[PDB]
Amino acid sequence: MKAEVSQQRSLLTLSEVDAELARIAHRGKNLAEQKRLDELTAQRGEVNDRLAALGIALEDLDAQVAKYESEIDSVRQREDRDRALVGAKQVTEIQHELETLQRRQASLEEQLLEVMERREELMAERSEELRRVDELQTELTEAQQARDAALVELDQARHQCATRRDALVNAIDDQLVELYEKQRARGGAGAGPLQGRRCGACRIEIDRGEIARITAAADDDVVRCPECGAILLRV
Ligand SMILES: [Zn+2]
């Protein structure tokens, strides 16, 4: 197999463009902007979970408040129903009933207050978590805007290299482009520069028996690295 040195020179730029396209794809999956978005999203979810659990607690205290202020309403009604006063003999019995009704309302007042201020404390804690999570939300959208913008730049850069690559392939004979892409299917670079003695693809230190035949090969000949099989470009 043989190929013009000018074709091999463009095959070198073709491998470089392909190597740049690979790192462009790699950085897309390892965006620092997404790592920042991942942390803000986790933190916002942490405040969202506490806000949800705080909501359950205030429901319980609201039910306690409602049940407490449903009992005194019957006590206030029991006093109102018995306020109508007609035999004075049994009135003493209705008078001792009012003394117990007043003690039931007074004891219930101590119970409502303990729940009222405890609910007042939780809603205060709920407000500080709302401002906390709202702060994170504004940061989260900024990180999300920064993440999307970083994806646009990578896609723009990838669109560049894809155009330069298309032009390169049209400038090299299909026979050489075929062997190159057949070598990329093996998992390696497909072609690399001979960096002194070591192949530019698999980066192996080629033995001293192969470099003699490689250096002796004609300039227009194509050479494959023994270890990996990639096209070694001496130019
Ligand atoms: Zn190699």
PDB file of all heavy atoms in Angstrom, residues 21 23-31 33 147-160, unseen atoms left out:
ATOM      1  N   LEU A  21     -12.104  16.532  18.297  1.00  0.00           N
ATOM      2  CA  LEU A  21     -13.521  16.195  18.398  1.00  0.00           C
ATOM      3  C   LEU A  21     -13.782  15.260  19.572  1.00  0.00           C
ATOM      4  O   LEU A  21     -14.831  15.347  20.224  1.00  0.00           O
ATOM      5  CB  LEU A  21     -14.002  15.560  17.093  1.00  0.00           C
ATOM      6  CG  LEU A  21     -14.343  16.523  15.956  1.00  0.00           C
ATOM      7  CD1 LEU A  21     -14.292  15.808  14.616  1.00  0.00           C
ATOM      8  CD2 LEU A  21     -15.711  17.148  16.181  1.00  0.00           C
ATOM      9  N   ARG A  23     -12.058  15.107  22.492  1.00  0.00           N
ATOM     10  CA  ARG A  23     -11.999  15.864  23.739  1.00  0.00           C
ATOM     11  C   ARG A  23     -13.171  16.831  23.863  1.00  0.00           C
ATOM     12  O   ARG A  23     -13.608  17.135  24.979  1.00  0.00           O
ATOM     13  CB  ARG A  23     -10.669  16.608  23.838  1.00  0.00           C
ATOM     14  CG  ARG A  23      -9.468  15.694  23.997  1.00  0.00           C
ATOM     15  CD  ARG A  23      -8.172  16.478  24.133  1.00  0.00           C
ATOM     16  NE  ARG A  23      -7.324  16.328  22.956  1.00  0.00           N
ATOM     17  CZ  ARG A  23      -7.206  17.242  21.999  1.00  0.00           C
ATOM     18  NH1 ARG A  23      -7.880  18.380  22.081  1.00  0.00           N
ATOM     19  NH2 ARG A  23      -6.410  17.021  20.961  1.00  0.00           N
ATOM     20  N   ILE A  24     -13.684  17.332  22.737  1.00  0.00           N
ATOM     21  CA  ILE A  24     -14.901  18.140  22.773  1.00  0.00           C
ATOM     22  C   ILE A  24     -16.063  17.313  23.305  1.00  0.00           C
ATOM     23  O   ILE A  24     -16.849  17.779  24.138  1.00  0.00           O
ATOM     24  CB  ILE A  24     -15.207  18.716  21.378  1.00  0.00           C
ATOM     25  CG1 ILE A  24     -14.219  19.832  21.024  1.00  0.00           C
ATOM     26  CG2 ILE A  24     -16.635  19.231  21.307  1.00  0.00           C
ATOM     27  CD1 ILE A  24     -14.506  20.496  19.693  1.00  0.00           C
ATOM     28  N   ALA A  25     -16.181  16.068  22.839  1.00  0.00           N
ATOM     29  CA  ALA A  25     -17.232  15.187  23.336  1.00  0.00           C
ATOM     30  C   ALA A  25     -17.007  14.831  24.800  1.00  0.00           C
ATOM     31  O   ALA A  25     -17.964  14.759  25.581  1.00  0.00           O
ATOM     32  CB  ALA A  25     -17.305  13.923  22.480  1.00  0.00           C
ATOM     33  N   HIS A  26     -15.749  14.612  25.190  1.00  0.00           N
ATOM     34  CA  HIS A  26     -15.448  14.257  26.574  1.00  0.00           C
ATOM     35  C   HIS A  26     -15.818  15.388  27.525  1.00  0.00           C
ATOM     36  O   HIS A  26     -16.421  15.158  28.580  1.00  0.00           O
ATOM     37  CB  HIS A  26     -13.966  13.903  26.710  1.00  0.00           C
ATOM     38  CG  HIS A  26     -13.549  13.569  28.108  1.00  0.00           C
ATOM     39  ND1 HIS A  26     -14.116  12.538  28.827  1.00  0.00           N
ATOM     40  CD2 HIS A  26     -12.621  14.129  28.920  1.00  0.00           C
ATOM     41  CE1 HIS A  26     -13.555  12.479  30.022  1.00  0.00           C
ATOM     42  NE2 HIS A  26     -12.645  13.432  30.104  1.00  0.00           N
ATOM     43  N   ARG A  27     -15.465  16.626  27.164  1.00  0.00           N
ATOM     44  CA  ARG A  27     -15.772  17.766  28.021  1.00  0.00           C
ATOM     45  C   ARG A  27     -17.274  17.990  28.145  1.00  0.00           C
ATOM     46  O   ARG A  27     -17.739  18.509  29.167  1.00  0.00           O
ATOM     47  CB  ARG A  27     -15.086  19.023  27.486  1.00  0.00           C
ATOM     48  CG  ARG A  27     -15.234  20.250  28.372  1.00  0.00           C
ATOM     49  CD  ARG A  27     -14.029  20.434  29.283  1.00  0.00           C
ATOM     50  NE  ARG A  27     -14.056  19.530  30.430  1.00  0.00           N
ATOM     51  CZ  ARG A  27     -13.143  18.593  30.666  1.00  0.00           C
ATOM     52  NH1 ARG A  27     -12.122  18.433  29.834  1.00  0.00           N
ATOM     53  NH2 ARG A  27     -13.248  17.816  31.736  1.00  0.00           N
ATOM     54  N   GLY A  28     -18.046  17.608  27.125  1.00  0.00           N
ATOM     55  CA  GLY A  28     -19.491  17.723  27.224  1.00  0.00           C
ATOM     56  C   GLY A  28     -20.065  16.871  28.339  1.00  0.00           C
ATOM     57  O   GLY A  28     -21.008  17.277  29.022  1.00  0.00           O
ATOM     58  N   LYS A  29     -19.496  15.683  28.545  1.00  0.00           N
ATOM     59  CA  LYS A  29     -19.927  14.800  29.619  1.00  0.00           C
ATOM     60  C   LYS A  29     -19.303  15.150  30.962  1.00  0.00           C
ATOM     61  O   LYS A  29     -19.774  14.656  31.993  1.00  0.00           O
ATOM     62  CB  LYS A  29     -19.598  13.347  29.267  1.00  0.00           C
ATOM     63  N   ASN A  30     -18.266  15.983  30.978  1.00  0.00           N
ATOM     64  CA  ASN A  30     -17.575  16.378  32.201  1.00  0.00           C
ATOM     65  C   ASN A  30     -17.519  17.895  32.307  1.00  0.00           C
ATOM     66  O   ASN A  30     -16.471  18.493  32.558  1.00  0.00           O
ATOM     67  CB  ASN A  30     -16.177  15.771  32.245  1.00  0.00           C
ATOM     68  CG  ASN A  30     -16.204  14.257  32.305  1.00  0.00           C
ATOM     69  OD1 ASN A  30     -16.087  13.666  33.378  1.00  0.00           O
ATOM     70  ND2 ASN A  30     -16.367  13.622  31.151  1.00  0.00           N
ATOM     71  N   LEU A  31     -18.667  18.538  32.111  1.00  0.00           N
ATOM     72  CA  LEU A  31     -18.746  19.991  32.176  1.00  0.00           C
ATOM     73  C   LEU A  31     -18.669  20.456  33.623  1.00  0.00           C
ATOM     74  O   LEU A  31     -19.442  19.998  34.470  1.00  0.00           O
ATOM     75  CB  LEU A  31     -20.042  20.483  31.538  1.00  0.00           C
ATOM     76  CG  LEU A  31     -19.963  21.157  30.169  1.00  0.00           C
ATOM     77  CD1 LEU A  31     -21.285  21.849  29.865  1.00  0.00           C
ATOM     78  CD2 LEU A  31     -18.798  22.135  30.106  1.00  0.00           C
ATOM     79  N   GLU A  33     -19.626  23.295  34.515  1.00  0.00           N
ATOM     80  CA  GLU A  33     -20.884  24.002  34.730  1.00  0.00           C
ATOM     81  C   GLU A  33     -21.988  23.065  35.204  1.00  0.00           C
ATOM     82  O   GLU A  33     -22.863  23.482  35.971  1.00  0.00           O
ATOM     83  CB  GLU A  33     -21.311  24.718  33.446  1.00  0.00           C
ATOM     84  CG  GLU A  33     -20.521  25.983  33.133  1.00  0.00           C
ATOM     85  CD  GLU A  33     -19.219  25.704  32.402  1.00  0.00           C
ATOM     86  OE1 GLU A  33     -18.827  24.522  32.306  1.00  0.00           O
ATOM     87  OE2 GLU A  33     -18.586  26.669  31.922  1.00  0.00           O
ATOM     88  N   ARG A 147     -24.778  26.540  32.228  1.00  0.00           N
ATOM     89  CA  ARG A 147     -24.611  25.195  31.687  1.00  0.00           C
ATOM     90  C   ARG A 147     -25.045  25.137  30.227  1.00  0.00           C
ATOM     91  O   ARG A 147     -24.325  24.607  29.374  1.00  0.00           O
ATOM     92  CB  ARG A 147     -25.402  24.187  32.523  1.00  0.00           C
ATOM     93  CG  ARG A 147     -24.980  22.734  32.330  1.00  0.00           C
ATOM     94  CD  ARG A 147     -25.681  22.090  31.137  1.00  0.00           C
ATOM     95  NE  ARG A 147     -27.108  22.399  31.099  1.00  0.00           N
ATOM     96  CZ  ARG A 147     -28.034  21.713  31.761  1.00  0.00           C
ATOM     97  NH1 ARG A 147     -27.678  20.680  32.510  1.00  0.00           N
ATOM     98  NH2 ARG A 147     -29.310  22.059  31.675  1.00  0.00           N
ATOM     99  N   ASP A 148     -26.233  25.667  29.926  1.00  0.00           N
ATOM    100  CA  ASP A 148     -26.725  25.638  28.554  1.00  0.00           C
ATOM    101  C   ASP A 148     -25.811  26.428  27.626  1.00  0.00           C
ATOM    102  O   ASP A 148     -25.563  26.013  26.489  1.00  0.00           O
ATOM    103  CB  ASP A 148     -28.153  26.180  28.496  1.00  0.00           C
ATOM    104  CG  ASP A 148     -29.153  25.254  29.159  1.00  0.00           C
ATOM    105  OD1 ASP A 148     -28.890  24.034  29.214  1.00  0.00           O
ATOM    106  OD2 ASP A 148     -30.202  25.746  29.626  1.00  0.00           O
ATOM    107  N   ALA A 149     -25.293  27.565  28.099  1.00  0.00           N
ATOM    108  CA  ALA A 149     -24.381  28.357  27.282  1.00  0.00           C
ATOM    109  C   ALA A 149     -23.095  27.594  26.991  1.00  0.00           C
ATOM    110  O   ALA A 149     -22.545  27.690  25.887  1.00  0.00           O
ATOM    111  CB  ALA A 149     -24.073  29.684  27.976  1.00  0.00           C
ATOM    112  N   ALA A 150     -22.602  26.829  27.967  1.00  0.00           N
ATOM    113  CA  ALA A 150     -21.408  26.021  27.740  1.00  0.00           C
ATOM    114  C   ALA A 150     -21.662  24.924  26.715  1.00  0.00           C
ATOM    115  O   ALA A 150     -20.760  24.576  25.944  1.00  0.00           O
ATOM    116  CB  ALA A 150     -20.921  25.419  29.057  1.00  0.00           C
ATOM    117  N   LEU A 151     -22.877  24.369  26.691  1.00  0.00           N
ATOM    118  CA  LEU A 151     -23.222  23.377  25.679  1.00  0.00           C
ATOM    119  C   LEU A 151     -23.298  23.993  24.288  1.00  0.00           C
ATOM    120  O   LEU A 151     -23.005  23.317  23.295  1.00  0.00           O
ATOM    121  CB  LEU A 151     -24.547  22.704  26.034  1.00  0.00           C
ATOM    122  CG  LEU A 151     -24.504  21.742  27.223  1.00  0.00           C
ATOM    123  CD1 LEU A 151     -25.799  20.954  27.326  1.00  0.00           C
ATOM    124  CD2 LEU A 151     -23.312  20.801  27.106  1.00  0.00           C
ATOM    125  N   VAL A 152     -23.692  25.265  24.196  1.00  0.00           N
ATOM    126  CA  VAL A 152     -23.741  25.934  22.899  1.00  0.00           C
ATOM    127  C   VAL A 152     -22.334  26.156  22.359  1.00  0.00           C
ATOM    128  O   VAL A 152     -22.086  26.006  21.157  1.00  0.00           O
ATOM    129  CB  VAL A 152     -24.519  27.257  23.014  1.00  0.00           C
ATOM    130  CG1 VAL A 152     -24.564  27.970  21.673  1.00  0.00           C
ATOM    131  CG2 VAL A 152     -25.919  27.000  23.524  1.00  0.00           C
ATOM    132  N   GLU A 153     -21.391  26.509  23.237  1.00  0.00           N
ATOM    133  CA  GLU A 153     -20.019  26.732  22.792  1.00  0.00           C
ATOM    134  C   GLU A 153     -19.365  25.430  22.345  1.00  0.00           C
ATOM    135  O   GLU A 153     -18.635  25.406  21.347  1.00  0.00           O
ATOM    136  CB  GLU A 153     -19.206  27.387  23.908  1.00  0.00           C
ATOM    137  CG  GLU A 153     -19.690  28.778  24.287  1.00  0.00           C
ATOM    138  CD  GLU A 153     -18.567  29.677  24.761  1.00  0.00           C
ATOM    139  OE1 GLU A 153     -17.399  29.234  24.739  1.00  0.00           O
ATOM    140  OE2 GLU A 153     -18.850  30.829  25.153  1.00  0.00           O
ATOM    141  N   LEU A 154     -19.615  24.336  23.070  1.00  0.00           N
ATOM    142  CA  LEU A 154     -19.065  23.046  22.668  1.00  0.00           C
ATOM    143  C   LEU A 154     -19.676  22.573  21.357  1.00  0.00           C
ATOM    144  O   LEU A 154     -18.976  22.015  20.503  1.00  0.00           O
ATOM    145  CB  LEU A 154     -19.290  22.013  23.772  1.00  0.00           C
ATOM    146  CG  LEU A 154     -18.331  22.084  24.960  1.00  0.00           C
ATOM    147  CD1 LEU A 154     -18.717  21.068  26.022  1.00  0.00           C
ATOM    148  CD2 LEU A 154     -16.894  21.870  24.505  1.00  0.00           C
ATOM    149  N   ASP A 155     -20.982  22.786  21.178  1.00  0.00           N
ATOM    150  CA  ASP A 155     -21.621  22.413  19.921  1.00  0.00           C
ATOM    151  C   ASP A 155     -21.139  23.296  18.777  1.00  0.00           C
ATOM    152  O   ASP A 155     -20.986  22.826  17.644  1.00  0.00           O
ATOM    153  CB  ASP A 155     -23.140  22.495  20.057  1.00  0.00           C
ATOM    154  CG  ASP A 155     -23.862  21.903  18.865  1.00  0.00           C
ATOM    155  OD1 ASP A 155     -23.597  20.729  18.530  1.00  0.00           O
ATOM    156  OD2 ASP A 155     -24.696  22.610  18.261  1.00  0.00           O
ATOM    157  N   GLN A 156     -20.897  24.579  19.054  1.00  0.00           N
ATOM    158  CA  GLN A 156     -20.333  25.454  18.032  1.00  0.00           C
ATOM    159  C   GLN A 156     -18.919  25.025  17.667  1.00  0.00           C
ATOM    160  O   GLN A 156     -18.569  24.963  16.484  1.00  0.00           O
ATOM    161  CB  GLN A 156     -20.353  26.905  18.511  1.00  0.00           C
ATOM    162  N   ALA A 157     -18.094  24.714  18.672  1.00  0.00           N
ATOM    163  CA  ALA A 157     -16.738  24.248  18.401  1.00  0.00           C
ATOM    164  C   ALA A 157     -16.751  22.913  17.667  1.00  0.00           C
ATOM    165  O   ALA A 157     -15.935  22.683  16.767  1.00  0.00           O
ATOM    166  CB  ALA A 157     -15.952  24.134  19.706  1.00  0.00           C
ATOM    167  N   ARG A 158     -17.671  22.019  18.040  1.00  0.00           N
ATOM    168  CA  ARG A 158     -17.786  20.743  17.341  1.00  0.00           C
ATOM    169  C   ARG A 158     -18.225  20.947  15.897  1.00  0.00           C
ATOM    170  O   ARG A 158     -17.749  20.253  14.991  1.00  0.00           O
ATOM    171  CB  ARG A 158     -18.763  19.827  18.077  1.00  0.00           C
ATOM    172  CG  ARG A 158     -19.011  18.495  17.383  1.00  0.00           C
ATOM    173  CD  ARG A 158     -20.410  17.973  17.669  1.00  0.00           C
ATOM    174  NE  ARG A 158     -21.443  18.918  17.254  1.00  0.00           N
ATOM    175  CZ  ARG A 158     -21.877  19.053  16.004  1.00  0.00           C
ATOM    176  NH1 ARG A 158     -21.370  18.299  15.038  1.00  0.00           N
ATOM    177  NH2 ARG A 158     -22.820  19.942  15.722  1.00  0.00           N
ATOM    178  N   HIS A 159     -19.131  21.900  15.662  1.00  0.00           N
ATOM    179  CA  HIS A 159     -19.567  22.186  14.298  1.00  0.00           C
ATOM    180  C   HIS A 159     -18.410  22.688  13.444  1.00  0.00           C
ATOM    181  O   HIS A 159     -18.349  22.402  12.241  1.00  0.00           O
ATOM    182  CB  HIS A 159     -20.707  23.205  14.310  1.00  0.00           C
ATOM    183  CG  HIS A 159     -21.320  23.437  12.965  1.00  0.00           C
ATOM    184  ND1 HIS A 159     -20.750  24.263  12.020  1.00  0.00           N
ATOM    185  CD2 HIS A 159     -22.453  22.952  12.404  1.00  0.00           C
ATOM    186  CE1 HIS A 159     -21.505  24.276  10.936  1.00  0.00           C
ATOM    187  NE2 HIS A 159     -22.545  23.489  11.144  1.00  0.00           N
ATOM    188  N   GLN A 160     -17.487  23.441  14.044  1.00  0.00           N
ATOM    189  CA  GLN A 160     -16.289  23.859  13.323  1.00  0.00           C
ATOM    190  C   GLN A 160     -15.480  22.647  12.874  1.00  0.00           C
ATOM    191  O   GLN A 160     -15.264  22.435  11.676  1.00  0.00           O
ATOM    192  CB  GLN A 160     -15.434  24.777  14.200  1.00  0.00           C
ATOM    193  CG  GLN A 160     -16.177  25.939  14.833  1.00  0.00           C
ATOM    194  CD  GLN A 160     -16.512  27.034  13.842  1.00  0.00           C
ATOM    195  OE1 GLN A 160     -15.623  27.661  13.267  1.00  0.00           O
ATOM    196  NE2 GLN A 160     -17.803  27.273  13.639  1.00  0.00           N
TER     197      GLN A 160
END
